Structure formats: structure tokens, C-alpha cells
Paper text:
It has been shown that RV attachment to cell surface carbohydrates, mediated by the VP8* domain of the spike protein VP4, is a required first step of an effective infection. Similar to other known VP8* structures, PVP8*s adopted a classical galectin-like fold with two twisted antiparallel β-sheets consisting of strands A, L, C, D, G, H and M, B, I, J, K, respectively. The common shallow cleft between the two β-sheets where the glycan-binding sites of other known RVs are located is wide in P similar to the P and P /P VP8*s but wider than the P /P and P VP8*s.
The GalNAc (GalNAc-I) forms hydrogen bonds with G171 and R172, while the Gal (Gal-II) makes hydrophobic interactions with G170 and G171. The amino acid residue of threonine that links to GalNAc-I pointed into the solvent. Finally, it was noticed that there is a slightly shifted orientation of the GlcNAc-containing motif inside the binding pocket between mucin core 2 and the type 1 HBGAs, leading to a significant orientation shift of the backbones between mucin core 2 and type 1 HBGA within the binding cleft. This indicated a mechanism for how P VP8* is able to achieve a broader binding specificity to the extended molecules of the two glycan types.
Residue numbers in the entry: 64 to 223
Write the structure that this text describes.
């Protein structure tokens, strides 16, 4: 009885709900911003990719990122910046057999998962304008209350 799946859309996630995205494919999985101090994008790289340059459109703008993933797992790079004049930088990585990606607004912070399945964990970026963060998803997603975060963490790590 999952709350979803919902099709790709731009929306403003409410505080204290996990958005859990079920990416089947490579490319941008999600991007979000409050236009002040957060811009984030999660980029998907398929298994067994040797080093190459690839293009991604972030907030309507083309960016070249060199990628690599010699794992049998999928790789999700979290790209980040805290100013509109700065370039995106690689902040964190989630290496996943499940292909599920999470984002949550809670407690003054923006949360994602990083590390490697089945031991992926949450970490944050800080913002002074949390409520104004909107996201665009590029794949189906589900919505899971923070009160059920252990269930979300299980899905991230072991699959729907
Ligand atoms: C350890 C833990 O529970 N971690 C959670 C994570 O919790 C996020 C919150 O971390 C707080 O600090 C912990 C819980 C301590 N009690 C503490 O006070 O240090 C943050 N407190 C800070 C930064 O001082 C808290 O932030 C506050 O939240 C309240 C209401 O939630 C209010 O918004 C305040 O303005 C704000 O300062 C949280 O950031 O949550 C993640 C995501 O669910 C879990 O994965 C993780 O396990």
C-alpha cells in the first residue's frame, strides 16, 4: 500500500516526507532548488562504465561531467552548489543495487542517501530556506512519511 507511483513532475515536497524515486535509467534522476542557497542534482550512471565525459541538463543548462563506474552497481552522483554563480561540484555518491534514490526536507536540512547498498545512510546539506526547495523528478516516485523512515531506508537498501 505504497503512496504512489506518481509520474515525473515539478513540485514542492512537504516537510517530513521522503520522496523515493525509482530510477530505471541513466541520466538526471532529480534536481531541486530554492534559488537561494541550494541546487542539487542526482545523476545516474549504469554499471561497468569506463571513464567518459557525458552531458547533463541541470535546471535547463547543459553541463559536461566526466564519469566512471566499474562496479556492477548503479552509481548516483549527488551534484551540489550553494550559490547561483558557482559551478556544480560532486558532493556525495550512492552506489546501489536497487536503483532507488531518496530526498527529504526536515529539520532545517535537506537529506539524501549516500554510501553503498545495503548500508546506505542519510546525510544532509544545510540551508536557511528549506521550505522553498522544489524538486523535479525524472522517474516515478513514491511518498513515505518520515515517521516511517526505517521502511524508506530498507527500500533504498534492499528494494521495493
Ligand atoms: C541523530 C538523528 O536522529 N538523526 C536523524 C536526523 O535528525 C535530523 C535532526 O538532527 C537534529 O539533531 C539531533 C536529532 C540532536 N537531538 C541534536 O539536537 O543535535 C537537528 N538539531 C540541530 C541541528 O540542532 C535537527 O534540527 C532541528 O529540527 C527541529 C525539528 O525537527 C527544528 O526544525 C529545528 O529548527 C532544527 O534545528 C534535525 O536536523 O534526521 C535524518 C532525516 O530524517 C535521519 O536520517 C537521521 O537518522
Amino acid at each position: 500500500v505504497l503512496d504512489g507511483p506518481y509520474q515525473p513532475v515539478t513540485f514542492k515536497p512537504p516537510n517530513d516526507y521522503w520522496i523515493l524515486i525509482n530510477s530505471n535509467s541513466n541520466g538526471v534522476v532529480l534536481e531541486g532548488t530554492n534559488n537561494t542557497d541550494v541546487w542539487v542534482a542526482i545523476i545516474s550512471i549504469e554499471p561497468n562504465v569506463n571513464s567518459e565525459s557525458r552531458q547533463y541538463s541541470l535546471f535547463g543548462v547543459n553541463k559536461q561531467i566526466t564519469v566512471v563506474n566499474t562496479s556492477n552497481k548503479w552509481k548516483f552522483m549527488e551534484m551540489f552548489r550553494n550559490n547561483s554563480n558557482a559551478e556544480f561540484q560532486h558532493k556525495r555518491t550512492l552506489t546501489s543495487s536497487t536503483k532507488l534514490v531518496g530526498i527529504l526536507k526536515h529539520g532545517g536540512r535537506l537529506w539524501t542517501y549516500h554510501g553503498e547498498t545495503p548500508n546506505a545512510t542519510t546525510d544532509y546539506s544545510t540551508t536557511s530556506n528549506l521550505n522553498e526547495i522544489s524538486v523535479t523528478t525524472y522517474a516515478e516516485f513514491y511518498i513515505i512519511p518520515r515517521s516511517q523512515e526505517s521502511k524508506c531506508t530498507e527500500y533504498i537498501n534492499t528494494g521495493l
